[PDB]
Amino acid sequence: NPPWAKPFELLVSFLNTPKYGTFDPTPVVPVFFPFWFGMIVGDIGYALLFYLVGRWLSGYVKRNEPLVIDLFALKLKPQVIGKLVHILNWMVFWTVVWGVIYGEFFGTFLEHLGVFGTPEHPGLIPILIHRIDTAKTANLLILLSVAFGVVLVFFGLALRAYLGLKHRHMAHFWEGVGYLGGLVGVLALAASYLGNLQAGWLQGLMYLGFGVFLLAVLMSRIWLMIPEIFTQAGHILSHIRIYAVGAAGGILAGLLTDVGFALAERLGLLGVLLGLLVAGVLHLLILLLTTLGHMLQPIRLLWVEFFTKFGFYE
Amino acid sequence: GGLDRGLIAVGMGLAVGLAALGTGVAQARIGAAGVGAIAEDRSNFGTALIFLLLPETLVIFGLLIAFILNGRL
Amino acid sequence: GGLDRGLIAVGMGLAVGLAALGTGVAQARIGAAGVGAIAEDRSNFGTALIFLLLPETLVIFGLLIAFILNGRL
Amino acid sequence: GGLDRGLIAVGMGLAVGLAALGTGVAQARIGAAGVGAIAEDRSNFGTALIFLLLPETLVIFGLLIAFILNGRL
Amino acid sequence: SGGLDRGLIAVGMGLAVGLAALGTGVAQARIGAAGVGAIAEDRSNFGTALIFLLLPETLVIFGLLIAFILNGRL
Amino acid sequence: GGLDRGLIAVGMGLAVGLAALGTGVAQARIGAAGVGAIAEDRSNFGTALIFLLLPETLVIFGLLIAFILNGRL
Amino acid sequence: GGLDRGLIAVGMGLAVGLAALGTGVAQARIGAAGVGAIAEDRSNFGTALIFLLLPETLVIFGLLIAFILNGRL
Amino acid sequence: GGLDRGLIAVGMGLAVGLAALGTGVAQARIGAAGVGAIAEDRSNFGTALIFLLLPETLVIFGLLIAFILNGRL
Amino acid sequence: GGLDRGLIAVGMGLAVGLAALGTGVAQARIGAAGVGAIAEDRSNFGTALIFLLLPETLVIFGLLIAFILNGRL
Amino acid sequence: GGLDRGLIAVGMGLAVGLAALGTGVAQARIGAAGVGAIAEDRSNFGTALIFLLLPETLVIFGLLIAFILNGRL
Amino acid sequence: GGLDRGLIAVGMGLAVGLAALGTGVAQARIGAAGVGAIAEDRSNFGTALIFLLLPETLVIFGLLIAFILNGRL
Amino acid sequence: GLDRGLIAVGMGLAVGLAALGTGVAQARIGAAGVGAIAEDRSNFGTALIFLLLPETLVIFGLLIAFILNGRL
Amino acid sequence: GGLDRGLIAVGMGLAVGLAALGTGVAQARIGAAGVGAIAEDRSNFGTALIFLLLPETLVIFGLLIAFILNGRL
């Protein structure tokens, strides 16, 4: 395994061990999971706090002391902390670049100082995606999440078909290609129903996708495609949760920053310290309550929506 | 008139909320059984997770209906 | 008036949400039994999976009614 | 008065949704018992399937009423 | 005002058939679970299990009857 | 001539539906106990059938109220 | 006229339906216990019958309120 | 108009129906325990009857409220 | 006459009904435990009675609010 | 003055009723456990009574909200 | 006009009532377990009281929302 | 204005149903935690954090209520 | 003027509240099983935490719908 993917091999290896002659999903994790984590958090202040946690863990590494928490019964002296530091470094790099894209540092801290600028309220530099203007970005991020899910599931189905070709498993290769054909048919139907512009060839694409799906249904001689194409459609559409958790966290952080700014504005000279105190305690409380899902969702999107496509659990 | 916008919003809220309620109702028992199986064997992680996260399609398609209603706004 | 479109939307929301709630209620106990059967013995996976996927016809019917209402919208 | 079509949609969505909820409530316990019987014997597949598919008549009747209401356009 | 009454008739019809279906499903849940258990025990209980499982269908039959009476009002 | 007819229809539907829900809730446990007694002895058929048929009076009363309201309609 | 009669019908239907639901909820557990006792002894028929028929007073009161409202209509 | 009379009727229906529902919810468990006690000993018939008929005061209060509201007309 | 009077009656009925439902829900389990304790000991009749009659304060508060609303009528 | 009075009344009735329902739901299980503890020991009457009377604060808060609204009424 | 004040009151009532219902739902099981623990050991009184008084934050939040809406009223 | 009361109804619905959901979670979680602390007395930290974890539901309910109050 | 803003407020409140109810229903049983698994063996903390924190998707999606609807405010 390459050195840049070895820390994430620990992330994937908690599940079943892949059989001999099957593709291992280890290299997908370093490219996709920190990417999704960065897109979810998208906060420079949160990235800095995670960097502080990472340098604390690196201090634990260089002192060579075990990290023992009696409450959680967790013991990992050198190497698990080293791999966790590597994973956190990738995660905070993606978080920093996505926070740059979103124009968010500790929420809406750009309200006090116009460093980042919307076109209506300009600053020194513009914001590519506000992500708090839900009217101007909902479609722009729903389509991005849908495209990411389609790419992931299509890659999984292509890997399934390739494994079926490798192992001469006809009922397996036909299963993969039938899922792919049904998926392109459903995608063409959705595009025709929602955003149709060129319905001429799109109907033919729908027809050939359904034809491939039905042909693989009869050829594979397995009748589980009919209720499971619903599940593959749900797996494609389940990547909306990236933008969903990202918008929820960003709006919560912006609301904490906004109530802090309002408290500072009302009390004036004496309200700066109190507003900073309440904003800080709310920020660490919200992070303590909701930070774990921020890694849980991007890693589960690889755990179930991606691994089940190529038979990781069989 | 704002009657159409308001009642479409009510409809999509009802759809996504009741879909989430059904998904949670399923996931309660499925996740309890999965946690028991994990505590017993620890080799049941793939099957337990697959059974637990399978009924999320209900809330996914409730979200889909809500998005179509947003388009109808 | 927009009452027609708004009430059509709340009707399709009710249909989708209650169908999803019903299939989630079914999948709760069905998936609990399936996870128990899987933990006891594998090669029960096919039967457990088909028994878990059978109650999705309810949300299928709910989505069909919702799409009919959307066509009427 | 456009409220006629919208309230018809509300009624038919309520009908299909509550019928789906009822048949899901039935299918929960029936499918749990069926999965247990399959794990026990594996020769009980016909009885388990017929007992699980019998409460589908409720959502069938709900769909029938929804289509009758759809006939009013 | 002339179309609102027909819509309310429709929603009453839907409510009747839906709640009747919910009631008979609630009955059929436990009745079918007991029937499946008795079948797995004996396999000679098919007639009694089917009779008891199909017995609460009279509730959705009554709901359908009331719904058709309401439908005839047009 | 107005909302009175449709609201009367809503009243009939609500009465029949809630009465049917109540008698179904009763018949669930009563029929489960009756099926158990039948599987145990088979000499309890008369008492089990009588106890199962007794809560039908609730849906009979609901139908009575609905027919009175239909006469009012 | 117009809307008072319909709401009176809604009220009386709601009264009789909820009373029927309550007495069905009572009769479920009471009849299950009675069927168990009768299967155990068969000399408990009178006690089981009177305990099952005692919750009928709830639907009797609901019917009384519904009839009073029907007379007021 | 007569909208006040209709909503008063709705109030009487709600009061007596929910009072009957609460009485039935109590009487379910109380009567199940009482039937078990009588099947065991049969000497505790008085205690079982008093404990079963004691929650009838809830539907008594509901009837009182309904009668007051009926007299308001 | 006045629509406000009808809504006052609706609220009063809702208050007394939901209070009765709550105290019935309490009295169900409390009276079941009391019946069991009396059947096993018979010396705890007073404690069972006071524990069963203690949740009557909920319907007492509901009746108090109902009477305040009736005075407002 | 006007419909605001009736809507204030229904709001305070909903507050009192749902608070009473919540404290009844708490007192059900708490009083069942307390009755069991008294039957076993009888030395824990103080603790059982304290735990039973503790969830009355919810109906106290509901009464406070209702009296505030009655002041606004 | 004047609908805003009554609808605000309905909002306060709904908020405090559903918060009270939620904390009562929590306190039911929590207080039952606490009563059992205190009856078993009597040294668990502090932990039982802490866990019983912990879910009161829900009704505290409901009261906070109700008081904010009262100040708006 | 007509709009402001229905906004209050929405805030009440949001915070009340969020409180109901987190209470439903805390019921079983707290019962299990009380049992574990009674049996071991060393499970206090895990039981307490498991009980305090579903408070995010009522946090989000208050979030929606305060958003509607700010827009109100 | 109009009630559009309040109606979309009601819709977003229903969405977030029902989503919260669903995920609370899931997390109840899942966290109970997790605490039970941790009590037997402290090494089961990670899987229990993962299973407990997985159903937050429901509140996440409800918040998503609420914020999208707030975008139209």
Q: Which residue has the tokens 């026990």?
A: D40
Nearest CA in chain A to C47: A224
Residue K5 identity? R
Q: Which one-letter DSSP state was computed for residue A105?
A: B
SS3 (DSSP) at F39: helix
Q: Which residue has the tokens 């919003």?
A: B9
Q: Testing the interface with H: which of G58, G59, G67 to mutate, by most H Cβ within 10 A?
A: G58
Contact A289 L53 (CB under 8 A): yes
Alpha helices in K1-73 (DSSP H): 3-40, 45-53, 56-72
Q: Which of F59, D21, C17, F18 is nearest to E26 (CA)?
A: D21
L–M interface: beta-carbon pairs under 8 A: 159
- Residue H19, CA distances (Å) to F42, H63, I16 in order: 39, 8, 8
DSSP helix, strand, coil percent of chain E (3-state; round to 5): 85, 0, 15
Could you give the CA distance from residue C33 to residue F47 in angstroms, rounded to a whole number?
33
Determine how many CB atoms are found less than 10 A away from the CB of residue L46.
Answer: 24
Q: Which residue has the tokens 């947003």?
A: B70
**Could you give the dihedral angle defined by the CA atoms of residues K3, K9, K12 and K16, in that order, rounded to the nearest 10 degrees?**
-140
Are the C-beta atoms of F44 and G39 separated by less than 8 Å?
yes
Alpha helices in A134-239 (DSSP H): 134-166, 170-195, 199-220, 225-237
Could you give the CA distance from residue J2 to residue A25 in angstroms, rounded to a whole number?
68
Please list every residue in chain D whose beta carbon sits closer than 8 Å to the beta carbon of residue E10: 7-8, 10-12, 69, 72
Looking from the CA of A290 toward its CB, the CA atoms found within 13 Å total 24
Beta-sheet pairing, A67-69 with A74-76: antiparallel
Determine how many CB atoms are found less than 10 A away from the CB of residue A285.
Answer: 13
SS3 (DSSP) at E72: coil
Of L13, L35, L68, nearest to M17 by CB-CB distance is L13
Question: Domains plus CATH for chain E?
Answer: 2-74 (1.20.20.10)
3+ Cβ–Cβ pairs closer than 8 Å linking B and G: no
- Residue A90, CA distances (Å) to A50, A307, F55 in order: 11, 22, 66
Q: Which of B5, J1, M2 is nearest to L2 (CA)?
A: M2
Q: Which of G22, F18, D19, A260 is nearest to H19 (CA)?
A: G22
Are the C-beta atoms of A173 and A165 separated by less than 8 Å?
yes
Contact F12 G9 (CB under 8 A): yes
Are the C-beta atoms of A18 and A312 separated by less than 8 Å?
yes
E strand or H helix that includes residue C8: helix C3-40
Looking from the CA of L64 toward its CB, the CA atoms found within 13 Å total 44
Q: What are phi and psi of A129, to 5 degrees?
A: -130, 120
Length of chain A: 314
Please list every residue in chain L whose beta carbon sits closer than 8 Å to the beta carbon of residue K61: 15, 19, 58, 61-62
Please list every residue in chain C whose beta carbon sits closer than 8 Å to the beta carbon of residue D3: 1, 3-4, 7
- Residue K67, CA distances (Å) to J71, M9, M16 in order: 14, 19, 21
Burial of A198 (0-12, 13-18, 19+ CB in 10 A): exposed
Please list every residue in chain E whose beta carbon sits closer than 8 Å to the beta carbon of residue D53: none
Length of chain I: 73
Q: Testing the interface with C: which of B12, B16, B30, B53 to mutate, by most C Cβ within 10 A?
A: B30
Contact J9 I12 (CB under 8 A): yes
Are the C-beta atoms of K64 and L66 separated by less than 8 Å?
no
Could you give the CA distance from residue B32 to residue B37 in angstroms, rounded to a whole number?
9
Question: For residue B65, what are the contacts with CB-CB under 8 A and spacing of at least 6?
Answer: B12, B15, B16, B19, C12, C13, C16, C63, C66
Looking from the CA of B18 toward its CB, the CA atoms found within 13 Å total 29
Could you give the CA distance from residue J65 to residue A56 in angstroms, rounded to a whole number?
50
Q: Which residue has the tokens 């605001």?
A: J4
CA dihedral for G39, G41, G46, G50, sign (positive or negative): negative
Are the C-beta atoms of E59 and F2 separated by less than 8 Å?
no
Contact H13 I13 (CB under 8 A): yes
3+ Cβ–Cβ pairs closer than 8 Å linking A and M: yes
The experimental method is cryo-EM
Contact I8 J12 (CB under 8 A): no
Which value in Å is the resolution of this experimental model? 2.7
Please list every residue in chain G whose beta carbon sits closer than 8 Å to the beta carbon of residue F2: 1-3
The strand pairing partners of A74, in sequence order, are A69
Q: Which of E32, M25, D46, H26 is nearest to I58 (CA)?
A: H26
Could you give the CA distance from residue E58 to residue J57 in angstroms, rounded to a whole number?
46
CB of F52 within 8 Å of any CB in chain E? yes
Shortest CA gap A43–chain L (Å): 20
DSSP labels, I29-45: HHHHHHHHHHHHTSTTH
Shortest CA gap H67–chain I (Å): 11
The strand pairing partners of A67, in sequence order, are A76
Alpha helices in chain H (DSSP H): 3-40, 45-53, 56-72
Q: Which of K39, F52, E33 is nearest to D37 (CA)?
A: E33
Q: Where are the beta strands (DSSP E) in chain E?
A: none
Please list every residue in chain C whose beta carbon sits closer than 8 Å to the beta carbon of residue A231: 53
Could you give the CA distance from residue A258 to residue A267 in angstroms, rounded to a whole number?
14
Could you give the CA distance from residue G3 to residue M6 in angstroms, rounded to a whole number?
26
Chains that touch K (3 or more CB pairs under 8 A): J, L
CA dihedral for L20, L21, L22, L27, sign (positive or negative): positive
Determine how many CB atoms are found less than 10 A away from the CB of residue A2.
Answer: 9
Q: Which of M73, A293, K7, A44 is nearest to L64 (CA)?
A: M73
Question: For residue A69, what are the contacts with CB-CB under 8 A and spacing of at least 6?
Answer: none
E strand or H helix that includes residue I8: helix I3-40
Contact H13 I14 (CB under 8 A): no
Q: Which one-letter DSSP state was computed for residue A19?
A: P
DSSP helix, strand, coil percent of chain J (3-state; round to 5): 90, 0, 10
Q: Testing the interface with C: which of B35, B64, B69 to mutate, by most C Cβ within 10 A?
A: B69
CB of G53 within 8 Å of any CB in chain H? no
Are the C-beta atoms of H4 and H43 separated by less than 8 Å?
no
Of B11, B20, B73, nearest to M61 by CB-CB distance is B20
Residue K23 identity? T
Could you give the CA distance from residue A183 to residue A181 in angstroms, rounded to a whole number?
5
SS3 (DSSP) at H73: coil
CB of I33 within 8 Å of any CB in chain J? yes
Nearest CA in chain I to H13: I13
Q: Which residue has the tokens 């205190």?
A: K38
Are the C-beta atoms of E59 and F23 separated by less than 8 Å?
yes
Of M49, M60, M71, nearest to A245 by CB-CB distance is M60
Q: Which one-letter DSSP state was computed for residue A21?
A: T
Could you give the CA distance from residue F56 to residue A305 in angstroms, rounded to a whole number?
49
Are the C-beta atoms of A273 and A280 separated by less than 8 Å?
no
Chains that touch D (3 or more CB pairs under 8 A): C, E
Question: For residue I67, what are the contacts with CB-CB under 8 A and spacing of at least 6?
Answer: none
DSSP labels, L10-65: HHHHHHHHHHHHHHHHHHHHHHHHHHHHHHHSS-HHHHHHHHHGGGHHHHHHHHHH
CA dihedral for I30, I32, I37, I39, sign (positive or negative): positive
Could you give the CA distance from residue A96 to residue F71 in angstroms, rounded to a whole number?
73
Could you give the CA distance from residue A99 to residue A119 in angstroms, rounded to a whole number?
18
Residue G44 identity? N
- Residue A33, CA distances (Å) to A148, A304, C50, I51, M68 in order: 12, 13, 31, 57, 26
Nearest CA in chain C to D56: C58
J–K interface: beta-carbon pairs under 8 A: 157
Intra-chain end-to-end CA distance of chain C, in Å: 13
Q: What are phi and psi of C5, to 5 degrees?
A: -65, -40
- Provide the token pair at G38: 């009768």
Are the C-beta atoms of L65 and L11 separated by less than 8 Å?
yes
The strand pairing partners of A108, in sequence order, are A105
CA A158 to chain centre: 21
Please list every residue in chain C whose beta carbon sits closer than 8 Å to the beta carbon of residue B63: none
Could you give the CA distance from residue M7 to residue M14 in angstroms, rounded to a whole number?
11
- Provide the token pair at A153: 């599931």
